[PDB]
With several copies, the nearest count.
Chain A
Amino acid sequence: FLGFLGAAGSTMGAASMTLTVQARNLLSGTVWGIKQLQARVLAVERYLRDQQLLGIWGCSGKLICCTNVPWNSSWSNRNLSEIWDNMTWLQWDKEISNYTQIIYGLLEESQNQQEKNEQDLLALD
């Protein structure tokens, strides 16, 4: 067993199999009378915002969710071969961090907003 954050130095191919371990550790349960009462509310609000963002897309209750947005805005300039076997998740965030605000909007307009409209007009008949 690797435990919490066990696959931090492992490659992407071995770190994607332990998402459940870090998924459950984001929600656990006057000095020291108002510290906890303000920390736990923030811990709940940080989780709720992420779960709402993951779900205004098409990915509601799945840990791995792959969509139909082309790989144009996020310029990795690197092929799948040396990404999932020669890089870790910490190095990935260093490369794609500027393009994580123009890729979070292509998942909300080009996907699951338009997509939810032809389905509403196809179950009409």
Chain B
Amino acid sequence: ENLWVTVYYGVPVWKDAETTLFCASDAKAYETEKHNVWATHACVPTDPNPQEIHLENVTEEFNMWKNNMVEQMHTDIISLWDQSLKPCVKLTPLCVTLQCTNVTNNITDMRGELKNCSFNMTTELRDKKQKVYSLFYRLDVVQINSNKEYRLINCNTSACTQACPKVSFEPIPIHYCAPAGFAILKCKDKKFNGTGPCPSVSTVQCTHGIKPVVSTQLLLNGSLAEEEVMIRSENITNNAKNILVQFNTPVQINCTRPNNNTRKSIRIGPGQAFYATGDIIGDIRQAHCNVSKATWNETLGKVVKQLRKHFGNNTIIRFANSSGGDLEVTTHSFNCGGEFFYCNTSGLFNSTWISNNDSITLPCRIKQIINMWQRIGQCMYAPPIQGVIRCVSNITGLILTRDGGSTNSTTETFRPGGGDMRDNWRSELYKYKVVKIEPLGVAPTRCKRRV
């Protein structure tokens, strides 16, 4: 009935696509003269106020387990960490034999944790040598066949780099923004499991502040829920998929290192220095972390109540400790002010639940030669820190796992897991999606072009 093709430009149509995002950093702490391992000089300042646009009658489909933003964030974090350790001292001449002996002195019983080692080291002049001593943890030295012979644990895999002493490891919020022609969709559904149609879709200019916190078996300083404890998994039937838990209310954890350290500088070359622990003044005590018993019990009860819905109605829920493996996957590993902790989370996951001012002290261990990002051939030798360190944090999540069930029911045991850093950022980049705007369309009107 006299209908002809009409071209419209600028129609609101979008399709799924993958692109590269950039920074947006707050200007409050952007101007300070403090260097961080996550660079800020290459990130543009953020907008003074975000622009939130609500979409009516729009129903999009999200999927938290197939998002490219997590992979891009992982690549950027790894690249930043690799770039932050370049311009300064490399500890190649430290692969020498050592004459180590027990520290003793004040031992509360840390019997063999610390060792007093002496060695020969080069000086600024090429033809002279100096004899110095340093204190090393038991997790860094390996005996080679009373003053016995020891050696560093990395002296047969790779000569590594010393951590730059001018940088800091404190996380800072990072915003990711899409380029022109691309939009970010935000799911505002409070009860969303990360996978499926979202009723409340809202166009957001960028993202919020996401702190790159590195931890295992627990989530520290994350995003809390709004209504109830949320359990999200890719396949709840499969036992080979990790389970992500989000806490409604955060519990408090305090960590400290009671020893008062003392850092001394040793010159190993022209313009190069090595930082060692000379003496410990005071008393020697173990590092520990504490969790309030009642708040943890209430949080675990809420987790059990919200976990009962998926599995059954009369099955018992049991919590056990880790199974085995490396030290980084069986302990709660984190960073407190520049010192790396490895805490024993065995008194936390120890309960059995039936359908019918105390604190929990967690012993921890400290290591100086670490190897993160699950790589082989690179270290990050953290220098000693003078004084006493303390940290107060929030526990706003869990990474649980399930064992192979027997008799198909009547028991379900959950133990903590971890190891992969993508699960840390999947818990925060779950409400976001990237789309590509297509502005060209055709529709039938009754125009005929003048001839």
Contact = CB atoms under 8 A, between A and B. Distances in A.
The listed residue with most A CB atoms (<10 A of its CB), out of B9, B76, B83, is: B9
A113 interface: no
B4 A8 contact: no
Contacts of B57: 8-10, 88
Interface in A36-90: 36, 38-40, 42-43, 46-47, 50, 53-54, 57-59, 63-71, 74, 76, 79-80, 83-84, 88-90
A117 to B, nearest CB: 13
Given A9-B55, A69-B5, A54 B440 contact: yes
Nearest to A11: B57
A15 to B, nearest CB: 6
Given A22-B439, A89-B11, A103-B442, A66 B20 contact: no
Nearest to B72: A35
Interface of A: 2-10, 12, 15-16, 19-23, 25-33, 35-36, 38-40, 42-43, 46-47, 50, 53-54, 57-59, 63-71, 74, 76, 79-80, 83-84, 88-90, 92-93, 96, 100, 103, 106-107, 115
28 contacts: A2-B53, A3-B51, A5-B183, A15-B11, A19-B10, A23-B9, A23-B10, A28-B180, A31-B39, A35-B20, A36-B22, A40-B179, A43-B180, A43-B181, A50-B439, A63-B9, A66-B4, A66-B5, A66-B449, A67-B447, A74-B442, A80-B3, A80-B445, A84-B443, A89-B12, A90-B12, A103-B5, A115-B451
B437 A26 contact: yes
Given A15-B11, A68-B449, A47 B181 contact: yes
B20 A15 contact: no
Given A6-B53, A66-B449, A71-B5, A22 B12 contact: yes
Contacts of A12: 443
Given A25-B180, A28-B180, A50-B439, A5 B12 contact: yes
Interface string B10-42: 111110000110110000000000000001001
The 8 closest A-B pairs by CB, nearest first: A9-B57, A66-B447, A19-B10, A66-B6, A32-B42, A69-B5, A71-B3, A23-B10
Interface of B: 1, 3-14, 19-20, 22-23, 39, 42-43, 51, 53, 55-58, 76, 79-80, 83, 179-181, 183, 203, 437-449, 451
Given A38-B20, A46-B181, A92-B441, A67 B5 contact: yes
The listed residue with most A CB atoms (<10 A of its CB), out of B12, B440, B449, is: B12
Contacts of B22: 32, 35-36, 39
Nearest to A65: B7
A22 B446 contact: no
Given A67-B5, A74-B5, 18 more contacts: A4-B183, A5-B437, A9-B56, A16-B11, A22-B12, A23-B10, A26-B181, A32-B23, A39-B22, A39-B179, A54-B440, A58-B449, A67-B447, A71-B444, A79-B1, A89-B12, A92-B441, A106-B5
A4 B203 contact: yes
